[PDB]
Amino acid sequence: MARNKPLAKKLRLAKALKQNRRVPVWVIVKTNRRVLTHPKRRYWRRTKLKE
Amino acid sequence: MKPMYRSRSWRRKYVRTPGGRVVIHFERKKPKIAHCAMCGRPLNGIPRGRPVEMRKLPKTKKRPERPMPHLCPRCMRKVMKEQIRAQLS
Amino acid sequence: MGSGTATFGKRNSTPTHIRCRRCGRVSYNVKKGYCAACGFGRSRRLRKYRWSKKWKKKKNAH
Amino acid sequence: MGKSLIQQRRGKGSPTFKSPSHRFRGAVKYIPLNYTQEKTLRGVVEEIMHDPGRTAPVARVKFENGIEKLIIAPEGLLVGQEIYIGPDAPIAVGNTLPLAKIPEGTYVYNIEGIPGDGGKYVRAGGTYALVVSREPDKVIVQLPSGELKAFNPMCRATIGVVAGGGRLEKPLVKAGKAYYKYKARNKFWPTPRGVKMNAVNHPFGGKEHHPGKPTTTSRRAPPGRKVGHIAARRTGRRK
Amino acid sequence: MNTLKMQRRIAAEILKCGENRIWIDPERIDDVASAITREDIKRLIKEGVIKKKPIKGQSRYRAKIRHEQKKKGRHRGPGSRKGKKTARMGKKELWIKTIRALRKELRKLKAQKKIDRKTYRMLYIRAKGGQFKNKHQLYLFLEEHGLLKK
RNA sequence: AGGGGCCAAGGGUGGGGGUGUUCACCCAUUAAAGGGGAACGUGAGCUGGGUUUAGACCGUCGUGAGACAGGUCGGAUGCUA
RNA sequence: GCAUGAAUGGCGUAACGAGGUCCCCGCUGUCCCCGGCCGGGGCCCGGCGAAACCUCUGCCUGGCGCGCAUGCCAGGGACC
RNA sequence: UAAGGUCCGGUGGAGCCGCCGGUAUCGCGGAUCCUGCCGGGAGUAGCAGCGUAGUCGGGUGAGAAUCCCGACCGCCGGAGGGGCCAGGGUUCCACGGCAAUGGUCGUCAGCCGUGGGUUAGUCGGUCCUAACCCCGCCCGUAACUCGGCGCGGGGGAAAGGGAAACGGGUUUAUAUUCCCGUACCGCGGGGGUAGGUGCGGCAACGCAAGCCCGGAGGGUGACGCCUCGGGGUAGGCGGACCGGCCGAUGAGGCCGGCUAAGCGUAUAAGCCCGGGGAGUGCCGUAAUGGCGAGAACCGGGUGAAAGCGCGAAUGGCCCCCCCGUUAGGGGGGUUCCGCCGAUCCCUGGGGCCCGUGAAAAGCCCUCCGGGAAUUCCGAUCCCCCGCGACCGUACCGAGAACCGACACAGGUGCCCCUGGGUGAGAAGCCUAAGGCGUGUCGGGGGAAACCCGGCCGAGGGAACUCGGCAAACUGGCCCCGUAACUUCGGGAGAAGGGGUGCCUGCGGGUGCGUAACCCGCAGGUCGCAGUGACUAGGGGGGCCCGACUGUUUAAUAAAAA
RNA sequence: CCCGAAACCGGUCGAUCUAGCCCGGGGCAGGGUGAAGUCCCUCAACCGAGGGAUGGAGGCCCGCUAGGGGUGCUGAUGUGCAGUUCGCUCCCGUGACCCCGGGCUAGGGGUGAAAGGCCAAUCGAGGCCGGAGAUAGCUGGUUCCCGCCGAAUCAUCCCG
RNA sequence: CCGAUAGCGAACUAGUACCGUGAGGGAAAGCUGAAAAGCACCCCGGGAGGGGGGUGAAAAGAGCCUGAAACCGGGCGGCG
RNA sequence: CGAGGCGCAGGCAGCCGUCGAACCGGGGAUUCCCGAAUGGGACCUCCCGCGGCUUAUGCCGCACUCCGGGGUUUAUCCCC
């Protein structure tokens, strides 16, 4: 099917997805150069996981 | 559908939509012949149907009128001869 | 098994190891029902050892 | 030194050496809670089946107190034969009675060794025990090996012979058909020889075909060294 | 920018035809570019800017002439043949065919009264036993006997 | 037509049959079918049959593991200067 | 029989084998003896772009020397 | 002497010396040192080898061989296409871009940025239980997060078992789920009537079921192997009619012509039942074979698929003639007859056996019936009111989303295995639906040497070499004929020899009436060659070893082991 | 002084690789040969003889069906496409066959049609951690300068 | 005592990124300036790229204090 | 403590605070799911047997294993 996620696993996948953003520009102003790179960036292909 | 392998509950009829899409459907397996069991013979006046279908169908099909619908009339043809001999003595 | 490693390796596909209900590391082996890291399923206790492993992360945390 | 041997694996009860118990069929019980004396008990052959792991045919019997149990099938049984259990069972084939109640010089099988333990003796295809002599003290019965064991007279047994004779009269034919039989039973196979097994694998025999030390082994020899002709009294076929 | 890659897939589902069959007018690329919706694609279908190629069919002429010729006993000499003898015609299958008529034949005759209950047994039984070639032969052999002929 | 000796390397000094064979044995030719050296010329050229891996067999030896320049089948030939 | 031999199996064997060895017929560039062709590389251009490894370097021959030298010694060749 | 000290200039823009006494994780050239940074190699190799693909106009943009549109030229054809399990995890979809990423460019994208999307009473999970597992308890152990038994309970298949649903429509993205239509599960009411808790028929048997808590029992759930035959229809193709098209001549060809799940009413070989009564004993099947424990033969009954109608004038195909910057539309007509040939699917026989081939949930029946019954009762019959606890659904599923660090020529399950031509064929080639030209770097030198794939070589016919290794030859099919040996089964497709095309005209078989195929025969005739292509065994003999088939050092040894 | 290996041992962690064992499923174009079994005709008193049919078995054959294996080319590659690949050729291809999912067996243990093979790029005893900075008579290295003196490479003993 | 190739695994986004089926293994990554004035306005450029002018001082102009060596371009001297 | 704050984190925007914030101490409220995880199983989710209560949804309290005491058909079964 689907497969075939468990509800929770989708919660976890969703979280990893959240971590896989790019910071916003304004924080960056607030910082005035700065913590960047966002360090977690996870690529779907590039990386695994956990499950 | 979700079953791919041609497993037993899987088995297939071709179905047409008019869309001309032509999609595969599963079919329910075709009926095994209930036995007398007291002597092995397929039973007259006893249905064939799919074991699910018998739930939502009629009971008339599921028996003959004579006692022990499960066994054949001739095997009952033994059993009464015995029952009386048993009441007599 | 030896070489021809590319030819071989279609399993791993199946998973036997996860984020654990108890610890959260990547070792709750679905098949055994045992976490390699924490020891959940196997024991009431957390896995901890003289060598250690578990301890090392904790000290490191301090 | 070398690994545990082929026999030592067996003993573990590990699964290559574990009998299936889920494709295999019932065991014999005669049941002594309704006793032999003050009998009550006849039954009807409900069906006859082949038991895979006995390599013999076996009977399901429907008793008239309402219990269903298997009894090892006699030759020349019909489905709807009545089998009786007790001493006041008729003296005929397939009927079960105590040894004392059974005549001398009649063929008998399924003999008890402790009264009321359900048959622990003569339960193979086509072979049979002979009642040679009977005395109220002890009844001596002659076993399939030619060898006489004394049993209590209040053991049960069934009159007749076992069914499924000729069993080794027909051959096994090929390695395929044989493979098929061993799955039906349990018997570690294909089984090779120790002689071209390496010195690690097995106590006797090296790289090439020749035995190490003598094949013939002690009766006080170790586990894992008790292979070959075990405690052989003689060997060969000559003076 | 200017997609159009989806718009083709979408058009494909509305038209219920293959992607490869879609014809977009070359003069009207700009108009299809501004097509975002299916409803737009549907407009463009009516205006004749989005069309379907015709589905081909392989010609059977060449088959037909062969089929007629093979129906007529031709193109089947020892030099066109590719399978072994039984292969064209299954030796069990033909026989399975052969015997049923010999039996129908006798059966027809059983109702007609021509042959007594007394000949038929020998004949029917003879048919299982392969004496008859068949229809012509059965007719001949009984005719020789006399009882058929009556 | 030889035997034996001197000068002389300019040129020539082969083809096959057995053998893993350098050697050697033989055949028919040939004018003659010479010898030796070059990492026992020549594997960042080939070939890889043999010698001396890991599989196996026989004989001998050895209690046995196991061995043999005894016999024997099989057993990879890397690199962009 | 340097140093065979009977269930540490002897002998023999139809059928069978991507097994070892030998012969014959057909066939055939394996060979006498190589040519031409074709397509992909090679080779050039444009864009893209690594590695192995790295004391140095225009030698050759002899002698010597750790006895198997571009570099010592003596000649010769020597423009990049 | 020197280890090292000191001064000037430039740079730099806050800390720093000397002496004396102390102290040490105290001085670096090597450690196939360790780490970090960097050059040559190179602007070289790779960006080729596998069935070798693009190309012209035009659109867009700063920039176009590789983005898009059309035309034109190809590959693919059980897959380079379609649907999916695992697994991945937003890769999906839209808009805006190109610094990086993509074996090259890039205006594209799977990258970057920013937004958005997976909706379920009737699909599956969930339930059952398997092989098997765990827990408590009993016990062991010095003891346990250890250990096997015996009890008692609980768990165990997203391809077993199993309640019930399809079609059409719509979305940028989802849909059997949202919508529309039609259908229906479970439970819970209500209202009627069969029902003095069913009437009516000799019988083989009739449906508008059988009041009821309870437990019991019994069938069906329910299972190994392979033929053959019987049925179903997905569906391939000729003829005829209706439109669309292409078009020397206006022919022939291409194309659209469809009917769902759910119901109602019908299934019928198996299998029973009456009548009758086995004469040299008869009869049947494709076949083995049945019969006096009921034949031959006549009437019945009885249980898979299948047809028709409902579902459905619809809807969905297919055209025509008008409205136009546009939007939203309108009116029309066709939407058909047969006969014929097939995978599979379902149903009987039958052959097999030193595998004799799990359970239960659930149904259906029956035994008993705790009680309620005549002011009655009950609802399997109808019809009708209400409701649906929970998780999953995107996309991919692959010679770029999996796994191999790589978008790796690898290799991992199913299903479409019956598209047309071919031909024994799920074979090759070609070709249709469908997909693609991103198995992602281009261009040039007629391109010489050399190297890989491959083609052809006179004469000679293994002289090569350890060795005919490699390669060649035979070749499909039909006919003839067929040795030694032999475990009589085989050897054997021995060997060797002949034939095979097209056309024109016949005959046979099966059937029904000229269908659908198949098997022969004669004449005429062309080529070098008729399996002309593709497909497609070289043969023969002695000897050694091992009986064979199988297995073996997964990855230098497949053998005699 | 510093570094340097093959071990050994103790406690742990793997059967998603792979081996066998078990449950429950699935896959395998087409073609050949033709056994038992059964039938008939003609000819014979019988003994049998000749012919033809029907049926359909096989650890069976052919086969580049799918799928499994991997013989030769000692070819192509050999800083690969690939840490075990490619094409032709070749073996098997209804089976002692292949395959999926579940489930079992763990390190002197398992498993093995048994090669010392296999048990997750690691097997004549896996991996991880600890003992552990093991210890080696053995290789390599051991860094500022200057001044002064300046060797022995012999003897006896020693599992040396 | 050490002082960012050092000292705690880790001066920080650390037990992170990442590896491994798992047990377990495991980095690197500190410095603007007085003030952010963190680059307006003007010229150029397809241009988010880059150059001139604009700060006490930009070898203080965005991992921005200093700013070595290897090494790379150009230029000067010399050789060629 | 007391006159600015709104964590690391200098942005933009807006906000709060004398009826005294931020902050510090003490006390209190809320404190998901999994976890010894205790009703049962699980791949961090799901199902279920009682009893209380609101008309219903909602909501509140409970049933693994010892010891101590009860209840009763003394089912060793259930309750504090």
Q: To which residue do tokens 């497969």 refer? A: A3
Could you give the CA distance from residue D229 to residue D217 in angstroms, rounded to a whole number? Answer: 6
CB contact under 8 A, C26 and A50: yes
Chain G positions within 7 A of any protein Cβ atom are 8-9
Residues paired with residue D57 on neighbouring β-strands, in sequence order: D50
Chain F: bases < 7 Å from a protein Cβ:
55-58, 62-67
Q: Measured from the CB, is B89 under 7 Å from any atom of strand H? A: no
**The residue type at C44:** R
Asked if C48 and C57 count as a contact pair (C-beta separation under 8 A), the reply is: no
Residue D181 near residue D54, CB atoms below 8 Å:
no
Cis peptide leading into C12, omega within 30 of 0?
yes
- Whether B81 contacts B50, CB under 8 Å: no
Nucleotide nearest to C15 (CA to C1'): I16
B57-69: buried (b, 16+ CB within 10 Å) or exposed (e) per residue? eeeeeeebeeeeb
**CB D236, CB D216: distance < 8 Å:** no
Give residue B87's Cα distance to chain centre. 35
Rounded-to-integer distance, Cα A22 and Cα D193, Å: 69
Residue (of D90, D95, D166, D159) closest to D122 by Cα position: D159
- Distance from the C44 Cα atom to the nearest Cα atom in chain A, whole angstroms: 23
Q: Specify the 3-state DSSP secondary structure of D62.
A: strand
Q: Which residues lie below 8 Å from residue E92, measured CB to CB, with a gap of 6+? A: none
What is the rounded distance in angstroms from the CA atom of residue D99 to the CA atom of residue D113? 11
Tokens (6 digits) for E68:
């007629």
What the block records as the tokens of E116 is: 């007594």
- Could you give the C-alpha distances from C38 to C43, C54, D218, D235, E55, in angstroms and in order? 9, 8, 52, 61, 64
Do residues D77 and D39 make contact, with C-beta atoms less than 8 angstroms apart? no
Cα–Cα dist D140/D150, whole Å? 4
- Contact with chain A for residue C30, Cβ under 8 A: no
Could you tell me if A51 lies within 8 Å of chain C, comparing CB atoms?
Answer: yes
Closest Cα partner for D55 from D217, D183, D229, D198? D183
Place of tokens 């071989």: C8
If DSSP codes are grouped into helix, strand and coil, which group holds residue D121? Answer: strand
* HEC readout, B23-75: EEEECCCCCCCCECCCCCCECCCCCCCCCCHHHHCCHHHHCCCCCCCCCCHHH
> What residues are paired with D151 via a beta bridge?
D139
Q: Which nucleotide is nearest to E96 (CA to C1')?
A: H286
Search chain A and give the residue with CA nearest C19: A51
Residue nearest to nucleotide I24 (CA to C1'): B7
Chains A and C touch (3+ CB pairs under 8 A): yes
Q: Which residues pair with C40 in a beta bridge?
A: C43
What is the experimental method? Answer: cryo-EM
Check C15 against A12: CB less than 8 A apart.
no
Q: Which of residues 204-233 of D touch strand G (CB under 7 A)?
A: 209-211
CA distance C33 to C38: 12
Q: D45 and D74 in contact (C-beta within 8 Å)? A: no
Tally the residues of chain A: 51
Partners of A51 on chain C (C-beta within 8 Å) are 15, 18-19
Helical (H) or strand (E) element with B87: helix B73-88
Helix, strand, coil share of chain D (percent; to 5): 10, 25, 70
Cβ of C5 near strand J (distance < 7 A): no
3-state helix, strand, coil in chain E (%, to 5): 60, 5, 35
Angle at Cα A22 formed by Cα A18 and Cα A26, nearest 5°? 115
Residue A32 to chain C, least CA–CA distance (Å)? 30
Q: How many CB atoms lie within 10 A of CB D95?
A: 20
> Which residues lie closer than 8 Å to D99 by C-beta, 6 or more apart?
D108, D111, D131, D134, D139, D141, D151, D152, D153, D154, D155, D156, D157
Q: Alpha helix (H) ranges present in chain D?
A: 6-10, 175-184
HSE of A17, CA atoms in CB hemisphere, 13 A? 6
